Design an enzyme around this catalytic site. Sequence first.
Site, PDB file in Angstrom:
ATOM      1  N   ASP B 104      -5.468 -13.436   3.708  1.00 19.62           N
ATOM      2  CA  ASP B 104      -4.560 -13.418   2.555  1.00 19.62           C
ATOM      3  C   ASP B 104      -4.721 -14.738   1.765  1.00 19.62           C
ATOM      4  O   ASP B 104      -5.836 -15.085   1.343  1.00 19.62           O
ATOM      5  CB  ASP B 104      -3.130 -13.203   3.090  1.00 19.62           C
ATOM      6  CG  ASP B 104      -2.005 -12.950   2.120  1.00 19.62           C
ATOM      7  OD1 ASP B 104      -1.891 -11.918   1.465  1.00 19.62           O
ATOM      8  OD2 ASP B 104      -1.211 -13.878   2.071  1.00 19.62           O
ATOM      9  N   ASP B 233      -6.156  -1.457   3.522  1.00 26.98           N
ATOM     10  CA  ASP B 233      -5.640  -2.695   2.949  1.00 26.98           C
ATOM     11  C   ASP B 233      -5.027  -2.476   1.569  1.00 26.98           C
ATOM     12  O   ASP B 233      -5.272  -1.472   0.897  1.00 26.98           O
ATOM     13  CB  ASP B 233      -6.757  -3.746   2.835  1.00 26.98           C
ATOM     14  CG  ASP B 233      -6.275  -5.180   2.468  1.00 26.98           C
ATOM     15  OD1 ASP B 233      -5.085  -5.434   2.477  1.00 26.98           O
ATOM     16  OD2 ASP B 233      -7.081  -5.976   2.071  1.00 26.98           O
ATOM     17  N   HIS B 261      -3.117  -4.581   6.052  1.00 26.25           N
ATOM     18  CA  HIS B 261      -3.209  -5.945   5.549  1.00 26.25           C
ATOM     19  C   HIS B 261      -3.251  -6.902   6.741  1.00 26.25           C
ATOM     20  O   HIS B 261      -4.129  -7.765   6.863  1.00 26.25           O
ATOM     21  CB  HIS B 261      -2.018  -6.260   4.625  1.00 26.25           C
ATOM     22  CG  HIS B 261      -1.968  -7.635   4.024  1.00 26.25           C
ATOM     23  ND1 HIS B 261      -1.491  -8.713   4.706  1.00 26.25           N
ATOM     24  CD2 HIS B 261      -2.304  -8.087   2.803  1.00 26.25           C
ATOM     25  CE1 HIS B 261      -1.524  -9.777   3.941  1.00 26.25           C
ATOM     26  NE2 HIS B 261      -2.017  -9.443   2.781  1.00 26.25           N
TER      27      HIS B 261
END
Lengths: 282, 281
Positions: B104, B233, B261
């Site tokens: 991320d 994702d 994710h």
Amino acid sequence: TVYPFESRCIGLSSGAVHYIDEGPDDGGRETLLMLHGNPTWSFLYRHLVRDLRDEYRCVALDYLGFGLSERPTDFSYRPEDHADVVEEFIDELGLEDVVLVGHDWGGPIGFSYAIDHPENVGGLVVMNTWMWPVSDDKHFSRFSKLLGGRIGRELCERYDLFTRVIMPMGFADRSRFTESAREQYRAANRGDRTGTGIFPQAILGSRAWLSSLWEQRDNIADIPARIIWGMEDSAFRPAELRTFEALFEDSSTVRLYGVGHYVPEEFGSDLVPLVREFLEEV
Amino acid sequence: TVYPFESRCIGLSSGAVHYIDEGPDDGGRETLLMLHGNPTWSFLYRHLVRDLRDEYRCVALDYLGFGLSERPTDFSYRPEDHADVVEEFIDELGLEDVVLVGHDWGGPIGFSYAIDHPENVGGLVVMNTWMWPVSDDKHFSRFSKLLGGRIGRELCERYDLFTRVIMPMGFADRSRFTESAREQYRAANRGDRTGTGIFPQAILGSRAWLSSLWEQRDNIADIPARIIWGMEDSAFRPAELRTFEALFEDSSTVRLYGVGHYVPEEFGSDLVPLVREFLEE
């Protein structure tokens, strides 16, 4: 009145194709070959051809099943077959050194030609293209599923959805979508709509092909290039624009404002200089 | 019970940071540095650290304003400041040759370190990252606008939206989001939620920074790399995965199935081999 350009036709082993061919026949100069998007005709580039004509030979090609070209009843609308149409066409016209310009589906096809025959490519210009499998962009994926499959084909053949709705949808400014442009796109008949209906399915099933082209980008990297992207586009995200620049060595991106998917029609006046600068620089 | 790992703390010029440091202190071996995502803690990588530990030194860092780190009242949550936190941390620990692993937001930060100091980078592993401005992906853009701006900050501070809803949203399999993991993420207090609330705004305003990092990719290309992407994702599209592979020379992509994710939490058991193979090769 709108499309005064000289029109010619090549019989190819997979069907005859129509093309626009402007500028001198005395090919002591580079030739630029334009590849249209969907559901468009070579008319998409009328402005681009008009102005580039006096400096470079400009050729624009109608893909089989589209425009004013032959539609074999057994033609498979796979990008692989479109690439073969382009390859044979380039050889038939004697176009030994060509700059390719592609939009939407024309992107991957011009790119593919360059992957297979980089030797005959004088440079590449791509705009709002479908290169690389599209997995994350849910906007496209939802449309691909609706416009693809059985229902896709039926929507295109029965309602001309792809031209009556999707075409205007791709414009940031629909007042530039003149009645003549609208007529010629809608001029395609019901059978021709089949090729159009297949297109988004071809993208969904061509992911292996698109992936292969992506992997071979390291070799296409030896060919100078420009990537044109509309700020209000639907086919390409700025994330992709940046990623493509990162990988395609010797390239540069251009961001156009107030423009959607159909860039050469809305902003042909900016595209002309972008292409001319490329053609002058290299 | 879940996080038995030795914990340490570095005072940095911009605030103290907490870190996990496992494996030998006898740094005759490569060190791997893990950078968490949002709103996560270094705990995100507990499994990854556990297994990599016996072969490579593993360090995991809590960013200022997150986890168990200091939250200066004047800290600006710009990626530039996060990058400085990482840079100073690497120097303070004596980590002369580091493989960076980022998720991320940790992606762009580890990437930035590598752009500024490629000399100290032994390789890069990135997963479900926010590299490159996100302009086309309307899913993220709509969330960025909601979770960013004034309303973003208020939603995070008042309702812990980012941890109570968005965190589970990023899992393909929420049964792996154990109560202990849920507690530690929610353990952050209201003031800490400000840093979290700013994050998506930082991405919206950091486009120039992300663009600059993209332009410098041609230089980062000399550092070996791996890109891990979940099939379900929300932060990264396969189009991007392919584009990044095309540009980042000497890299390879990995596609993980049944994962969202938060990859290292759901599929830490696959991530470990992916990282170990990179580190062995």
